[PDB]
Design an enzyme around this catalytic site. Sequence first.
Site, PDB file in Angstrom:
ATOM      1  N   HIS A  65      -7.131  -6.768  -0.407  1.00 28.11           N
ATOM      2  CA  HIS A  65      -6.037  -5.809  -0.327  1.00 28.11           C
ATOM      3  C   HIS A  65      -4.972  -6.234   0.673  1.00 28.11           C
ATOM      4  CE1 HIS A  65      -4.125  -1.884  -0.654  1.00 28.11           C
ATOM      5  NE2 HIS A  65      -4.352  -1.586   0.612  1.00 28.11           N
ATOM      6  N   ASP A 108      -8.963  -5.859  -5.573  1.00 26.87           N
ATOM      7  CA  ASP A 108      -8.393  -4.969  -4.560  1.00 26.87           C
ATOM      8  C   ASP A 108      -9.180  -3.662  -4.550  1.00 26.87           C
ATOM      9  OD1 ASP A 108      -6.837  -2.884  -3.255  1.00 26.87           O
ATOM     10  OD2 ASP A 108      -5.049  -4.159  -3.379  1.00 26.87           O
ATOM     11  N   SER A 149       0.851  -1.208   0.000  1.00 27.04           N
ATOM     12  CA  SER A 149       0.000   0.000   0.000  1.00 27.04           C
ATOM     13  C   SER A 149       0.881   1.251   0.000  1.00 27.04           C
ATOM     14  CB  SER A 149      -0.990  -0.137   1.174  1.00 27.04           C
ATOM     15  OG  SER A 149      -1.337   1.109   1.769  1.00 27.04           O
TER      16      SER A 149
END
EC number: 3.1.-.-
Length: 269
Positions: A248, A219, A98
């Site tokens: 995710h 995601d 991320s």
Amino acid sequence: APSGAKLLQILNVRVVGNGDRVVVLSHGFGTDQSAWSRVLPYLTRDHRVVLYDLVCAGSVNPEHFDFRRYDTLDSYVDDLLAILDALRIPRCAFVGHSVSAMIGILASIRRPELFAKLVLIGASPRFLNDNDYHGGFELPEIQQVFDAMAANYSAWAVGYAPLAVGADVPAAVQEFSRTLFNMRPDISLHVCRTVFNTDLRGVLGMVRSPCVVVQTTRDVSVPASVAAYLRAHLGGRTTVEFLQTEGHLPHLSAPGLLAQVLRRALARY
């Protein structure tokens, strides 16, 4: 700003495992380094693993969160390099999820000889759309996230946690909500603003480390087409790996399958 030496305590740096092949694990938004706890034993028999908390993690004392310094991702990069330099680590593989995938891209450009390989999970160079570019968000809807986080952080968190986990894994939902709720709401909002103001498309060609992009089947924050864009524009040799799992946060929801990909990516660098 705290030195690298001081960051070792402030950011809860931990070094575990055997050998001289070094792997750094850098967690993403809404978690802390405990997100890696399920895949970690798959790496520590063969690698020396460096873990740390981003300064925005709930496990870092909110007194160290400098709202001035950290309104750019460049300052998170500063912290990572300061930790690696204090540890006297000259070469490593970096795994980022991320926001940490963005931090990894920027760190590789700042210190090309330090990063022998990048592994990017849940990775995007820009979350906002732009003509021929699908990021997943238009501006009025990132603004809607901001207003919801500010108006009712707790309600925003309980709604976001199952969307982020994606798959039906209730222990992953509860563990992600826990670390989401450990964050102070204003810090959580501040980091989200910083990430949505980051656009790395113009510097992808400056990355020279080899990269593995890890893509799950779905995601919430990363469209399927982003991995292809990264492969096309990253300046090093890049491969996309496919996790046949949804979400995710595969290090929370599918640790065994994720570990298989990581061991492959980290076999030779």
